[PDB]
């Protein structure tokens, strides 16, 4: 299967843009909709690929898989696309050094796990494609989990891991 | 810098093909030369990108960086391009499972270090590009190290890590 995904902010698409929050660094132009395409009057295009696990260990994968919801739940009419760029200092670090910041210090997985099965979370990579961002992260959930997701954001943005994030944008969406 | 690299088997290039050893699975067609281009009458093209560290820890990087030779040494008139693909079962494993096979069991980095500084080794990734191979590995050295390189290839093709390799080709080259 084609692991590449494109996100085109413009006048067409499956998702209506509710709000774009330019958290850190240059933002993305406000647009009417986002069109998601599998494969590679529009304002911007983002792309990334699905890839293998980079940090999670087996016990962590087992916990996530036990409560990970699927995409495209009927109830999951809200979504958020959050492109993220990390710093050169982050990328120069070795594998043991990044894993320790990611979990042992920041507890990325343990914290995110608390918000499943409510939130469906998916990760795409794009630093290797030469894109402006390093990751395209995608979340979808029913309105009942909006407050919980907003809470999770504040939590991760306070984390040690986020000291290495240098560009970030929120594209809040509603399923059409 | 652009991190994409292309290897075109045909009748032009910086490198003459000495031989091709179809080690495992379908091979590559014999050609006169290989052309290497930086960016995205020819028989085949391979491509991959340089990426961040996936397994090596800080102390291993420091030991590697202490002896790793540069590319394009005057005496490094031989080169070997070895595309590699690993199994689906490999990519399904978690990060800890793969690290433990990579170093704890196979000692890929420790064995590799023994063959530096003679052998310059570079790694490119292409599974994420949808390529038929997962990695393009590049090696260049002087003739005095040809025998030691063949020794290295045998020590690695015998390790537990290589039990997950399901396709492999050796393209031996000579600088023009
Ligand atoms: C909601 C529940 C969440 C869960 C269960 C979760 C889980 C995970 C896991 C297990 C990984 C590691 C993947 C791997 O090993 O390759 C990861 C990576 C990542 N997550 Fe989350 N996450 C959640 C929320 C979030 C949020 C809200 C954000 C952004 C605001 C985010 C941003 C990222 C990024 C950027 C990465 C890549 C880290 C890197 O490779 O440097 N995640 N996530
Ligand atoms: C000659 C000395 C060598 C040294 C010092 C060395 C070192 C390394 C290191 C440290 C890594 C881990 C990179 C990371 O953490 O992302 C790596 C990856 C790799 N090397 Fe070697 N290597 C050598 C020879 C070879 C040879 C001869 C081959 C093939 C015959 C090879 C094939 C690979 C492959 C396929 C990977 C990717 C592994 C994966 O990501 O699953 N290497 N090498
Ligand atoms: O966990 N980032 O979808
Ligand atoms: O370690 N790849 O030459």
Are the C-beta atoms of residues A21 and A66 closer than 8 Å to each other? no
B115 is in an annotated binding site: no
Task: Please give the Cα distance from A26 to B13 (Å, whole number).
Answer: 41
Tokens read off for B88: 């689906």
Answer for the pair A172, A22: CB distance below 8 angstroms, yes or no. no
Six-digit token string for B54: 């996936």
Which of B82-93 are b and which e, b meaning 16 or more Cβ less than 10 Å from the residue's Cβ?
bbbbbeeebeeb
Method of structure determination: X-ray
Alpha-carbon torsion angle B161, B131, B27, B16, nearest 10: -100
Q: Is B140 helix (H, G, I), strand (E, B) or coil?
A: strand
Separation between Cα atoms, residue A32 and residue A173, nearest integer Å: 10
At A50 the three-state DSSP class reads coil
Contact A57 B125 (CB under 8 A): no
**Among chain B residues, CA nearest to A49:** B128
User: What is the B53 CA–ligand 3 centroid distance (Å)?
Assistant: 20
Put simply, the answer to whether A94 touches B53 (Cβ < 8 Å) is: yes
The partner residue sitting opposite B52, judged by closest CB among A57, A61, A91, is: A91
Q: Could you write out the DSSP letters of every residue in B5-30?
A: EEEEEES-SSEEEEEEEEEESS----
Question: Do residues B5 and B166 touch, judged by C-beta distance below 8 A?
Answer: no
Distance CA B45, CA A56 (A): 34
Q: Is the CB of B171 under 6 A from ligand 2?
A: no
The secondary structure of B91-114 as a DSSP string is HHS-HHHHHIIIIIIT-HHHHHHT
The structure tokens 């590559």 sit at: B28
Structure tokens, B56: 């090596």
Beta bridge partners of A86: A165
Q: How many CA atoms lie within 13 A of A85 on its CB side?
A: 19
Rounded Cα distance, A164 and B147, in Å: 45
Locus of tokens 């995409």? A71
* Contact: B99, A94; criterion CB under 8 Å: no
The pair of three-digit structure tokens given for residue B23, joined into one six-digit string: 């080690």
Distance in Å, CA B127 to ligand 4 centroid = 15
* Closest-CA residue to B139 (of B158, B128, B126, B153): B153
Range of the domain at B90: 1-176
Number of domains in chain A: 1
Question: Which one, of A18, A20, A34, A3, lies nearest residue A168 by Cα?
Answer: A20
CB pairs under 8 A between A and B: 54
Which residues touch B21 (CB under 8 Å, ≥6 apart)?
Answer: B169, B170, B172
Say yes or no for a CB contact (<8 Å) between B57 and A3.
no
Residue A113: φ, ψ to 5°: -60, -35
CA distance A133 to A125: 9
Ligand number nearest CA of B112 is 2
CA distances from B15 to B31, B142, B175 (A): 11, 14, 5
């Amino acid at each position: 299967p084609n692991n590449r995904y494109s996100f085109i902010g413009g006048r067409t698409g499956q998702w209506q843009v509710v709000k774009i929050r330019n958290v850190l660094g240059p933002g993305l132009q406000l647009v009417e909709k986002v069109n998601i395409l599998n494969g590679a009057d529009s304002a911007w295009r983002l792309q990334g690929f699905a890839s293998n696990i980079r940090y999670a260990i087996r016990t962590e994968l087992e916990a996530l898989q036990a409560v990970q919801p699927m995409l495209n739940r009927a109830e999951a009419i809200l979504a958020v696309l959050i492109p993220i760029k990390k710093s050169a200092q982050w990328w120069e670090m070795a594998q043991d050094e990044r894993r320790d910041i990611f979990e042992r210090e920041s507890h990325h997985t343990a914290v995110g796990l608390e918000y499943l099965p409510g939130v469906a979370a998916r990760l795409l990579h794009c630093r290797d494609l030469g894109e402006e961002f390093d990751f395209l992260t995608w979340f979808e959930f029913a309105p009942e989990h909006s407050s919980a997701f907003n809470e999770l954001l504040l939590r991760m943005r306070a984390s040690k891991e986020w000291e290495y994030v240098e560009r970030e944008v929120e594209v809040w969406l509603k399923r059409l």
